[PDB]
Amino acid sequence: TTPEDWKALAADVRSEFQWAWQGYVAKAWGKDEINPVSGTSRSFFIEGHDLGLSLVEALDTLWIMGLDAEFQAGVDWVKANLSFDVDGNAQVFETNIRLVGGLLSAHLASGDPVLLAKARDLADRLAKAFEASPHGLPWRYVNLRTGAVSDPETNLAEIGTYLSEFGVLSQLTGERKYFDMAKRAMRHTLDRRSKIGLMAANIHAMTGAFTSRNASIDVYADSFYEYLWDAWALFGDEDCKRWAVECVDAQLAHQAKRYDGRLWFPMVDFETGAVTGTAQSESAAYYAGLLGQVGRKAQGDDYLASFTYLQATFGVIPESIDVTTGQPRRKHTGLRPEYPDACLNLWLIDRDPRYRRLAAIHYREMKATSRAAFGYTALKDITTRPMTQDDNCPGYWWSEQMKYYYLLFSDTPRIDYGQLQLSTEANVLRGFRK
Template identity: 40%
Template sequence: MLGIAAEKPAAPAVAQTVDDAEAARLAAQVKTEFLHAWGGYKTHAWGHDALKPLSKASQDWYAQSLLMTPVDALDTMVLMGLDEEAKGARELIATQLSFDKDLDVKHFEVVIRLLGGLLSAYQLTGDERLLKQAEDLGTRLLPAFDTPTGLPYVNVNLRTGKGQGVESNPAEAGTLLLEYGTLSKLTGNPVFYEKAKRALVETYKRRSKLDLVGERFDVVTGKWTNTSSHIGARIDSYYEYLWKCWKLFDDKECLAMWTPSVAAANRYNAEEVDGALWFGQVDMHTGKRTGHEYGALDAFYPGLLAYSGDIDRARRLQDSSFAMWNLHGIEPEAYDYRKREITSAGYPLRPEIVESTWYLYRLTGDPQYRVMGKKLFEDFVRHCRTEAGYAAIEDVTTMKQADDMESFVLAETFKYFYLLFAPPETIDLEKVVLNTEAHPLRRVVPTP
């Protein structure tokens, strides 16, 4: 714990408006800043996974590049109408990306970033090469599910299919069906849907009598190894996919799992402190309060609540997220809302608070959320922009930058900022569901 005392978060004030003309100006500015970050990648890290924005160098996740940033960024370019940039990225991916590599990769991350990115880019462009790559990748990843429980190994070798890493969590096991399911719908091969669906169901089946899940389990034995229950890292997107898989696939079993799960989270994790709503940690079996931390990853939850129709609770929790952001002008990774202390001071360019701002604006039409988004964007540019791109923040109390620009800043953070200010028809929420990496996946209508 850093022990940094902070003032009591103030309720967000709306002292201005963002009319359509200002929104159009901001959308154009977001596009300009996206191009700045993408340009830094092209200049200093082309062909690699990511840019190091301070040293102006490249970095790869593994021994060989998997083009994380181009794949993650491609659908953002298409949505922004950056046709030439999108074409260049698409050709790089279609001609240079191969998954026939002897690499042990993180299954979950590769699914949400690469498989999700390829599928979304295919649906937006119609480029069959991207679908072929997605099918090849999905096939290589499938052996990850070959465990006694059906809960996937953490890592899988792209060439041999050997899985390893047995301590996983609800997010990594339960955040796979949008991508694998879409791959099934597009290829006509049901095995992808079935494997990912089983992993989601097996996670749900291990919930406690309170309908809560824990933070970690063993994929071989299926036993919990950490029973802390919350809405943050290692659990977060499990809740997200219960709802979104119902939205994308009309899978009634997902809705049946979502309903008691979200009710339990709202009952046990929610905590009122000085009139503000926060979500913290409890034991999954007893419901006993074990922690009072909320942070950048938890800030996805207001958007999910709004998306599922729980607008009032979403508004209140979004106010807390925004108050946490305004403590220093950028949100910390974790904050103890009872002690009013930052417990993890970094900011790796996360998108979740922007995501929730967009959902709340789209679903309520309340202009305060565009005003909120403008403040978030201006702070983001002020503190994270560098000469070569955008840098993570090592410590939000000093705003010292870190030499890291994760691919999700181009897949998610810039995309959600753009969607907030762009015309609403840019994304049709009745036909499209965004995966946890903000890759828009469109409903696939069965061929008669």
């Protein structure tokens, strides 16, 4: 057997990323997303008022890969062109994790003050969504120019995925208000945990009350649980360290369920642990890595194995599965990053080469299924051979899985792997070595 040449595989990831970037420059320059089958662009936040989403998402990946000319071309576009004084509604959660976080990682890589100025300007526009709630729970949408808010029927992910970006803003700016605003919203829902330690995933920004009874690790909730741990790691916050482990141990006690010998975390009633759903999202795979981070690595490996089963059986992990049968519930995909997310997070603990093996399967399968004329695309149908394609490269592809693969394979000297911290959008918030 020829041992894998990990440096060669990293160089292939870089080559493919640079090739994809060239397609973006050719077909979608300054636009939010490329449609790489048609060779066109689409808007993400505001129809017809693109904000360079994929360009911004790509920046820290480009830098980490040593694609310096490409990085600088993107940074220079941002500095000349990007602004947020726009009379249109933006989804607060998406805007923070993609644009605030993408500008912050680019700022930390480069030192360029303008990138921080723009991140902070955008955060100040998002802050109006928090200020519009007497509980500090952000409304889901805000008008970037006027501050007008819409839709208070929100969820843990959309109230609780700010503290990393906002806390880094507080560190860099010296203004504590960003950290405090993000932490306050998380504390609100944690103070409403049931006696079994769970939160329902759906919450109202104005009443402050839960609007469902369903505890979740995936839809409506995922990154809330990450950002508790990540705030301990990034800021030393004692409360978040406590909360992170309490929340995960409640989930292990009441949501961990085995079906056909495999670990899943279906939805349960947040006050009884009784099962209220049978679906698991592909996107739940982040949790395997979080389990390892919080000191539950055997459980994290067991959960990873459930997704390794889906990859081995279906090639591409189905977008959703029925835990009771282990079979797909959907045939389309979102070109999703969570399996290599988990592999990188678990690999950062002891550098076990098994995680590299598994992530290499995932990268090669992405190449075999999602490659299109001008980049990489989400899929229409994973059950046909070949798998049929839809026509969209999601913005998160630019920040997430190509970075994950590259960090797993490259051992790049541009990252201090002991200090590396990643947001839920894979924006690097600590660990650059200039």
